[PDB]
């Protein structure tokens, strides 16, 4: 059903687009400060690039998992654009650690609460789904007893 | 079509935030042992924490994939059931795992046995659904002949 | 939705074996060099399987995005095609690396090039799918002026 779950494809293949371009900056790095793999070691400021992209591609799941559930429970355009906001902290949260450890805060706080309302219509969206039916089955055993 | 996915979806979103719990947990342990990013490395103990969370992020999209094409495609109710199963397993392999090396092997046991047979259901499923045209592709084809 | 959606299931199970398989040989190659959890660091033969493993794992949320993606938005038979190649070029990256980093790299290429089709399947079908509505939208908006 392409209809009710473009905008949520098209948020996953942004967020895709956008750890690719984390994965080549890790590249570059590599390449700048002479890091081989195997190493993930080196000098602060290449290991400040793995570890934004380590924790970004640690947290992507997280992230598709939740547009998806929240986008189809509870509204598409609302997780779509939670989506957007979470990617934009992400690139933020990437740009930032790569200059210094401290200035992925603010941008990580960003991309945490974006992810946190993702999650928080997630679980709305559910409970609207199931809690009636729960509450029903609950009522029809009591009547039977009354 | 929410009505033939809820379960997954609730599976799924519990999931999410047990990965988020472990991500909280992996911070605590970053103050409390004064590790900083963007080193991994420090005390055993810090380290058993980080690796714990990492180790259940690394599995987490092998454990959403094969939760919903088995969900999909063998019962959902019987993936929703085995990816309880996994994630509680999961909850003690982090638990024993941050208390010690030797303590996440039970937890990594059951949480295997639950995955493995989440495969297999997905696996059953989809036998189900290719074997039989398949089997009639092969048939007609040597029918034509004989 | 069990039949448009069946072979991408059955390339994402693949998937999932075939990380089981990755996650197998560094537990194989953490028994031979006696390397215990929670360190992920030793001699350069076992700090590349285990390397290969964590590489192939935080790649394979993108392959599974972009695949369902291609495969409901652009064609499923293509989208699974691609997704094949994928993941035959991982497996000969994990042999690869395992055996030497410079080995890494034909196969590296090859599936990055498996990826980016599938990201430009994905994006043409999104495309396809929006850019009408869009130009109508444009259209519509100028027809009124004019
Ligand atoms: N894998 C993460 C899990 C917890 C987390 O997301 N921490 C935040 C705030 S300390 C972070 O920016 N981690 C930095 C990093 O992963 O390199 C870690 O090692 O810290
Ligand atoms: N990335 C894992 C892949 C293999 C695996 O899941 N091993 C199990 C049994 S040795 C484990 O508990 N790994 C501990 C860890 O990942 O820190 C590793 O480095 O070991
Ligand atoms: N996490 C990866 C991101 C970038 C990447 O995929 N690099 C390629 C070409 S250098 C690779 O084979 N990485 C080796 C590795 O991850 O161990 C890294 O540390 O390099």
Redesign the pocket.
């Known amino acids: 059903m392409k209809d009710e779950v473009a905008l949520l494809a098209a948020v996953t293949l942004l967020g895709v687009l956008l750890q690719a371009y984390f994965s080549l900056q890790v590249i570059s790095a590599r390449r700048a400060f002479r890091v081989s793999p195997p190493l993930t070691t080196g000098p602060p400021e290449f290991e400040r690039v793995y ?2 992209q ?2 970004c591609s ?2 992507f799941p997280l992230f598709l998992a939740t547009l998806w559930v929240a986008g189809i429970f509870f509204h598409e355009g609302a997780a779509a654009l939670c989506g957007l906001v979470y990617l934009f902290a992400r690139l933020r949260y990437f740009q930032g ?1 790569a200059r210094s450890a401290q200035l ?1 805060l603010a941008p ?1 706080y960003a991309s945490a609460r974006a992810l946190w309302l993702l999650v928080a219509l997630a679980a709305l969206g559910l409970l609207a789904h199931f809690l009636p039916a729960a509450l029903r089955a609950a009522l029809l055993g009591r009547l039977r007893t009354l």
Request: hydrophobic share 35%; no cysteine; aromatic share 22%.
């Open positions: 570890r934004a380590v924790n640690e947290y650690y992925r990580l």
